[PDB]
Amino acid sequence: MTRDQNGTWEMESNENFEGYMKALDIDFATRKIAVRLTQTKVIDQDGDNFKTKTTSTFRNYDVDFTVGVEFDEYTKSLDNRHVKALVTWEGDVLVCVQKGEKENRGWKQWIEGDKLYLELTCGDQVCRQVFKKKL
Ligand SMILES: CCCCCCCCCCCCCCCC(=O)OC(CO)CO
């Protein structure tokens, strides 16, 4: 069922979110706040149509997309940049490339049973997050 990412996922680990944020030029005051936050991620998946919501005490980030359809992503409340984003399946891994000002920007998201993994990349920095399927 490795492509079914539907549900609510609760963060349990968040490695080098700081390195990823610094690569995006996030201001120090925001990084100092955001590096501690536990995140929740809600995915509404209907085949290749995705509606996702990543939430916290500090800020939320929503992004909707269709696999294989390049779209104009505006990273509101993150680094507030415009990127051309494409999400595709590479095996059972959901792979997004975000081309714009920053090089080697994207993410990879996949399921392992009751765990959701998300690797965020920007240039020289990789952030590794693990979420647990909501109890
Ligand atoms: C980082 C600057 C200040 C943060 C301030 C606090 C925000 C924490 C929650 C949102 C954090 C969201 C990070 C990117 C997630 C992403 O875009 O990938 C998703 C798209 O679908 C994969 O599910």
Numbering used by the authors: 0 to 134
Study text:
Present in the small intestine, cellular retinol binding protein 2 (CRBP2) plays an important role in the uptake, transport, and metabolism of dietary retinoids. All CRBPs share the same protein structure architecture. These small soluble proteins fold into a single β-barrel that shields the central hydrophobic cavity that constitutes a solitary binding site for retinoids. Access to the binding pocket is governed by a “portal region” composed of conformationally flexible loops connecting neighboring β-strands. By examining chemical libraries of bioactive lipids, we provided evidence for the selective interaction of CRBP2 with a subset of nonretinoid ligands with the highest affinity for sn-1 and sn-2 MAGs that contain polyunsaturated C18-C20 acyl chains.
A similar Kd was measured for 2-palmitoyl glycerol (2-PG; Kd = 51.2 ± 7.7 nM). However, how can the relatively good binding of 2-PG and 2-LaG be explained if their 16- and 12-carbon acyl chains are too short to interact with the β3-β4 loop? The answer to this question can be determined from the structures of CRBP2 complex in these lipids. They revealed an unexpected change in the orientation of the palmitoyl and lauroyl chains as compared with longer acyl moieties. In contrast, the palmitoyl in 2-PG adapted an inverse orientation, twisting first toward the β3-β4 loop before interacting with the α-helices II and I. Thus, the interaction with the β3-β4 loop is prioritized, enabling the stabilization of the ligand inside the binding cavity and the protein as whole in the holoconfiguration. The presence of two alternative binding modes that depend on the length of the acyl chains explains the significant decline in the affinity of MAGs with fatty acid moieties shorter than 16 carbon atoms. The inability to stabilize the close conformation most likely contributes to the rapid diffusion of the ligand out of the binding pocket. This hypothesis is further supported by the comparison of normalized crystallographic B-factors calculated for CRBP2 in complex with 2-AG or 2-OG and 2-PG or 2-LaG. The binding of MAGs with shorter and saturated fatty acid chains results in a significant increase in the structural dynamics of α-helix I and β3-β4 loop of the protein's entry port.
